[PDB]
Amino acid sequence: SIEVTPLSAHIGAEIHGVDLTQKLEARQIAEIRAALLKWRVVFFREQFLTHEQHVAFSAQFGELTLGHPVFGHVEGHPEVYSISQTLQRPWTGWHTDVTAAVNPPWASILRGVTIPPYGGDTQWTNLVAAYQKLSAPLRSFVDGLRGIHRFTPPILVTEHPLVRVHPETGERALYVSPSFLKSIVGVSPRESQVLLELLWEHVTRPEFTVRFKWQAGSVAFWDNRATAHLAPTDIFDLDFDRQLYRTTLVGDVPVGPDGTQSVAIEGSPVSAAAAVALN
Amino acid sequence: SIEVTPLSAHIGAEIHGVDLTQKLEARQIAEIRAALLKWRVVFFREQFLTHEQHVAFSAQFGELTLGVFGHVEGHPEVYSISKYQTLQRPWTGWHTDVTAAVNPPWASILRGVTIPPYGGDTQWTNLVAAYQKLSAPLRSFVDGLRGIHRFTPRILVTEHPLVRVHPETGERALYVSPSFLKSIVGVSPRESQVLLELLWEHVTRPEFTVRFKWQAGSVAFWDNRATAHLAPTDIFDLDFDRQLYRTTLVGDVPVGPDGTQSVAIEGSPV
Ligand code: NA
Ligand code: NA
């Protein structure tokens, strides 16, 4: 029986009592999965893993994505991605991974190998809590809306529901991936702009968020169907080296409250892997 | 010699190696004060203090303010922070202590006594870093501006500089206390509104902030001349009691880059 230590009112929890270098029992896997669904992102400490152990841990929860030939490439490990002026608004940098694709990954597992003594914190926000905190007329309104997500690698275009029904819990997530969601289908450009800024300001309210200060050996495991996250920018500032590795798990096509699946509009398989590797 | 452990690139540090139940020696006091000036807010863990010890620790750094509100029996210097629809913007709730007064307290010391297992985190933002990250034309513009801060519970109105020159470090702070600053003097209402929302969005950017998860016996000590902070809103959201106690230290009248002191408009000083 794992130990689960929540970190805020509704998002984030530490898990202790699990040795991630070892294969886990079925009960441990189910307990971790339930904690992840409940707290949206779960964290481990003092887990010093090889690439093989990181992949082996990940495969207990789903199918691993297979990477990009250049971006984040780790030799011998296609499943492992290496992680080593803008117009500034409250939602700048906040995103859900690869939502420009028709089947975004449902989860990611990020481990810290070389971690600075300070700087480089990551944040997550709870898109289910955010949906629920919209007023009832706003919820009914966005239930029926669709959004275009775009990404251009250094071109993916997908139409997603603005409200994603979680396939394991049935909860509704405000699926507004701010870095990638560009427009709301069927409304005017100004209507779309105003509504997106309203929802993006909403989802970044502190009551929906948790902040994580990394240490060497830390692991973050988050549910992309219910979260967006924010990468640090204070690292490009300090002298410290920073090396993390990420795996991600293949997800299904999102569905909105009316049952309509997401629709691919444009995109190459190569462009999708670049988004997985870079987002 | 104290141990200082920074918590972000430019704001927040934990201090270890000090027993706050005892009178500190002058070297320890000086080291804590330097760490406070450098990191804007400093934190202590596992410091289980009486009200008397809280006051005594505070008095080593300045003069205690003497505040029915938050009343603590036998200790007029200690304020009780007890658990017992607004318009939501990024700056909602962010503030610098009592800037509606002509002499806001220069520091506050907040200690946690009854602390929820989760929920109730506090955040601070670095107003000096925020000033410095404005572009040069924006810095020069706000250097010359004044703002009206108001509080009505008696009624306090004060004109402060928008840029406060720190009396000990000489640094410039973007002194925009979002809960209390209401208007910019000498510009139109719409100009004031737009510029305040610009600066308030700016000062709440995550690169300027630090978040602190309380535990029982934790202490936060912050420099109000260089910070604003944000209280948690999840308190009634959860069925956990939450009890903290606060002391504050008497501050001086702020000064802007041109040397102009703040001006009391209505009300009495701290
Ligand atoms: Na990402
Ligand atoms: Na306050």
For residue B187, how many C-alpha atoms fall within 13 Å in the half-sphere facing its CB? Answer: 18
Question: Contact at 8 Å (CB) between A47 and A219?
Answer: yes
Contact A91, A201 (CB under 8 A): yes
The whole-angstrom separation of Cα B229 and Cα A256 is: 38
CB of B215 within 8 Å of a chain A CB? The answer is no
CA distance B148 to B265: 9
Q: Is A86 exposed, middle or buried (0-12, 13-18, 19+ CB in 10 A)?
A: exposed
Instruction: Tell me whether residues B117 and A6 touch, CB distance under 8 A.
Output: yes
Ligand nearest to the CA of A104: 1
Does the CA dihedral A139-A143-A148-A151 come out positive or negative? positive
Q: How far apart, in whole angstroms, are the C-alpha atoms of residue A33 and residue A165? A: 18
Question: For residue A223, which amino acid is it?
Answer: D
**A216 burial via Cβ count (<10 Å: 0-12, 13-18, 19+):** middle
Q: Check CB contact under 8 Å for A9 and B207.
A: no
Structural class in CATH, domain B1-270: alpha beta
Q: How many CA atoms lie within 13 A of A102 on its CB side?
A: 10
Question: Which of the residues of A are catalytic?
Answer: 95, 97, 229, 246
Closest CA to A165 of A39, A262, A35, A70: A262
Answer for the pair A216, A184: CB distance below 8 angstroms, yes or no. no
Residue B250 neighbours by CB distance under 10 Å: 16
CB contact under 8 A, A8 and B88: no
Angle, alpha carbons B64-B66-B70 (nearest 5°): 115
Header resolution in angstroms:
1.8
Tell me A105's DSSP state: -
Query: How is domain A1-279 classified at the CATH fold level?
Result: Double-stranded beta-helix (3.60.130)
**B246 in active site:** yes
Element (H, E) at B26: helix B26-39
Hey, of A234, A238, A242, which one would you mutate to test binding to chain B, going by the most B CBs within 10 A of its CB? Answer: A234
Could you identify the residue written with the tokens 């490990």?
A77
User: CB-side exposure of A146: number of CA atoms within 13 Å?
Assistant: 17
The values of phi and psi at residue A193, to 5°, are -60, -50
How far does residue B104's CA lie from ligand 2's centre (Å)? Answer: 11
How far is A33 from A194, CA to CA, in rounded Å?
Answer: 37
Helix (H, G, I), strand (E, B) or coil at A79: coil
Measured between alpha carbons, how far is residue B238 from residues B83, B116, B167, B241 in Å?
A: 11, 9, 41, 9
Distance from CA of A202 to the nearest CA of B (A): 8
- Conformational region of residue B77, where left means phi above 0, alpha means psi within -120 to 50, and beta covers everything else: alpha
Q: What length is written for chain A?
A: 279
B207: closest CA of chain A, how far (Å): 6
Task: Judge contact between B218 and B120, C-beta under 8 A.
Answer: no
Per the CB < 8 A criterion, the answer to whether A278 and A248 are in contact is no
- In single-letter form, the type of residue at position B113 comes to V
Q: Where are the alpha helices (DSSP H) in chain A?
A: 26-39, 51-59, 127-133, 136-143, 189-203, 269-278
Backbone angles phi, psi at A274, to 5 degrees: -65, -35
Yes or no: say if B130 and B10 are a contact pair by the CB < 8 Å rule.
Answer: no
Position B213, amino acid: K
Of all ligands present, the nearest one to the C-alpha of A275 is 1
CA B243 vs CA A112, A147, B44, B122: distances in Å: 35, 44, 17, 13
Q: How many residues does chain B have?
A: 270
Cβ–Cβ under 8 Å, residues A106 and A223: yes
Residues whose CB is less than 8 angstroms from the CB of residue A241 and which lie 6 or more positions away in sequence, other chains included: A84, A114, A116
Flag if B123 and A206 touch (Cβ within 8 Å): yes
Q: How was this structure determined?
A: X-ray
What is the distance between the terminal CA atoms of chain A, rounded to a whole angstrom? 34
Q: Which ligand neighbours the alpha carbon of A100 most closely?
A: 1
In B146-232, beta strands by DSSP E: 146-151, 156-161, 163-165, 172-174, 181-184, 209-212, 219-223, 227-230
> Encoding tokens for residue A187?
């409304």
SS3 B4: strand
**CA A223, A238, A90, B135: dihedral to nearest 10 degrees?**
-170
